[PDB]
Amino acid sequence: PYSQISGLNALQLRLMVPVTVVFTKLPFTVVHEREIPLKYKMKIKCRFQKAYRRALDVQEAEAMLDEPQEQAEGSLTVYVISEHSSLLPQDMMSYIGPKRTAVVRGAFNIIGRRIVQVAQAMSLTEDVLAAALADHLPEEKRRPLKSSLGYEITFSLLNPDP
């Protein structure tokens, strides 16, 4: 398939991260996306799809509210908490827990910027992909191990003087 290969020469990859924001008026479903410049024809564009769902009714909370069945790879789930909810310390405004669950104090642009910052911290920042693709980068960096179908770990104990 020479024609298909030539089409693949310029592949417009876009990456979608399903994030469901839960507030505690209008499901805005705002989408924030950006594209890091690549030196060659192939380009990428990370896309954030925020659901802005209303509530359906800190480590203690996430343990019981998170549904293990509703787990999707590369899908974040943040929870809006009150500006005085005291679930997290008042000096802490964003909480980044494990298992794709976050909490942000607070639709509005000011809070939406916080969700964007938290999502960038937890998924698909420009630096993560810069390591993955470096031949297309316009610039260390290549420290990450390369991709493979398998890896082998060997734990050797050196005993120079038995």
UniProtKB/Swiss-Prot annotation:
Effect recorded for residue 1 to A: No effect on function in GPI-anchor attachment to protein
Record bears the keyword Glycoprotein: yes
Coiled-coil features, chain-numbered ranges: none
Protein's name according to its UniProt entry: GPI-anchor transamidase component PIGS
Location of the protein in the cell: Endoplasmic reticulum membrane
GO BP term (any one): attachment of GPI anchor to protein
Family of the protein in this entry: Belongs to the PIGS family.
Shown part of the complete sequence: 47 to 238 of 555
Keywords recorded for this protein, A-Z: Disease variant, Endoplasmic reticulum, Epilepsy, Glycoprotein, GPI-anchor biosynthesis, Membrane, Transmembrane, Transmembrane helix
Its biological purpose: Component of the glycosylphosphatidylinositol-anchor (GPI-anchor) transamidase (GPI-T) complex that catalyzes the formation of the linkage between a proprotein and a GPI-anchor and participates in GPI anchored protein biosynthesis.
Illness association: Glycosylphosphatidylinositol biosynthesis defect 18: An autosomal recessive disorder with onset in utero or early infancy and characterized by severe global developmental delay, seizures, hypotonia, weakness, ataxia, and dysmorphic facial features.
GO cellular component, one term: membrane
Subunit details: Heteropentamer. Part of the GPI-anchor transamidase complex, consisting of PIGK, PIGT, PIGS, PIGU and GAA1.
Primary location group: endoplasmic reticulum
Domain of life: Eukaryota
Keyword Calcium included in the entry's annotation: no
